[PDB]
Amino acid sequence: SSHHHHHHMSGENLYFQGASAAIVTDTGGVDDKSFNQSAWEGLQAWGKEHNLSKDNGFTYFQSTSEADYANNLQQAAGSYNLIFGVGFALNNAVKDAAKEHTDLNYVLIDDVIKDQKNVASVTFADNESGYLAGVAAAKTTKTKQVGFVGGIESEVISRFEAGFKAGVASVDPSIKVQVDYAGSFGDAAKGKTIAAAQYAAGADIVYQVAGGTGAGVFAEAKSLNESRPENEKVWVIGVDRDQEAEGKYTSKDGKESNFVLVSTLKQVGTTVKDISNKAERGEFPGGQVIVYSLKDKGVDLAVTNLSEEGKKAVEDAKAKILDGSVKVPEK
Ligand SMILES: Nc1nc2c(ncn2[C@@H]2O[C@H](CO)[C@@H](O)[C@H]2O)c(=O)[nH]1
Numbered sequence: 001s002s003h004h005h006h007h008h009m010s011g012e013n014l015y016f017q018g019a020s021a022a023i024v025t026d027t028g029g030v031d032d033k034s035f036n037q038s039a040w041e042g043l044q045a046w047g048k049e050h051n052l053s054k055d056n057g058f059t060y061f062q063s064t065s066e067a068d069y070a071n072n073l074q075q076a077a078g079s080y081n082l083i084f085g086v087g088f089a090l091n092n093a094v095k096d097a098a099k100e101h102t103d104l105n106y107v108l109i110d111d112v113i114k115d116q117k118n119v120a121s122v123t124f125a126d127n128e129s130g131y132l133a134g135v136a137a138a139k140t141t142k143t144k145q146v147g148f149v150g151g152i153e154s155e156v157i158s159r160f161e162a163g164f165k166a167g168v169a170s171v172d173p174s175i176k177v178q179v180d181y182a183g184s185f186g187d188a189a190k191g192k193t194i195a196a197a198q199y200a201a202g203a204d205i206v207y208q209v210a211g212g213t214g215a216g217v218f219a220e221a222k223s224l225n226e227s228r229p230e231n232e233k234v235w236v237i238g239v240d241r242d243q244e245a246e247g248k249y250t251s252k253d254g255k256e257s258n259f260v261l262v263s264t265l266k267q268v269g270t271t272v273k274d275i276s277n278k279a280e281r282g283e284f285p286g287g288q289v290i291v292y293s294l295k296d297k298g299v300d301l302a303v304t305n306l307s308e309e310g311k312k313a314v315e316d317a318k319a320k321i322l323d324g325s326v327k328v329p330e331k
């Protein structure tokens with residue numbers, strides 16, 4: 001209201017203490033065009049905003065295996081005071097590291113840690129985005145059969161699967177959803193053989209929810225589509241990022257086209273940048289569980305190459321999820 005006792009201070013003597021933020025990444029890698037890449041793009045954007053460069057204020061530790069999680073988190077604790085575990089698999093390793101270094105701040109993305117003051121947890125309503133992808137798929141199938149390729153069987157991927165199945169059923173319960181898990185988020189070759197089998201059995205759309213494994217699903221669809229006419233093409237649904245650019249191909253008939261129907265979005269990069277800024281300002285949300293959903297645009301659907309009829313079904317289904325009229329199952 002008033003500040004009568006005051007002293008003039010030079011801007012040269014006032015300074016804001018910066019933080020150093022690192023992500024510890026799973027097998028998928030920061031080049032997975034999806035989940036880990038979104039996180040890494042977010043951290044790079046944050047680095048650029050704070051005048052930093054890789055291994056000088058921000059970095060990523062790629063995990064070779066589960067045994068490398070603890071090694072990478074301990075290496076990170078040498079130089080970084082905000083450490084993100086990217087993926088549900090880092091749950092136990094982040095719990096242990098947070099108990100050893102109570103002075104550092106940790107974030108688990110895609111899972112919850114309870115009762116740890118220096119750990120924040122982030123989850124996404126991927127069931128809600130999955131539902132929208134299902135409505136999209138149900139409005140474009142000609143064969144009335146669609147594929148789902150998961151990475152590792154988990155509460156997280158079951159959220160996508162349940163939402164996707166529910167969204168397909170909301171339009172046409174006649175449609176068959178073939179489900180297959182790769183057992184990995186970093187196995188393109190297994191993604192390719194699963195997609196090959198799903199397409200050969202008469203799926204005309206595959207939704208890939210397996211991070212970097214999904215590069216194989218894109219490779220299979222591209223090979224089938226290059227050896228066919230444009231109007232007989234087979235679709236993939238993108239995940240985490242808008243993957244439209246990965247769908248570029250040329251048909252047997254010489255026509256330039258795109259086989260990405262739609263992508264589910266998961267704003268992991270946005271979350272990494274926002275929490276990094278809060279940690280640097282001394283407002284780290286330790287002990288809290290942050291839930292992103294359709295409402296706050298933490299998840300969404302990019303409607304890329306969907307028919308106008310499909311976009312209407314998606315916009316209508318989105319309204320019903322926001323209003324509460326449709327409750328999307330999580331399992
Ligand atoms: N634990 C883990 N989950 C991943 C990874 N890549 C992708 N995912 C999950 O799979 C979904 C589809 O890529 C993402 O939204 C994440 O939930 C990874 O490397 N590790």
Ligand code: NI
Nearest residue numbers: 001002003004
């Ligand atoms: Ni005042």
Ligand code: NI
Nearest residue numbers: 004005006007
């Ligand atoms: Ni004074």
Ligand code: NI
Nearest residue numbers: 018019050280
């Ligand atoms: Ni800074």
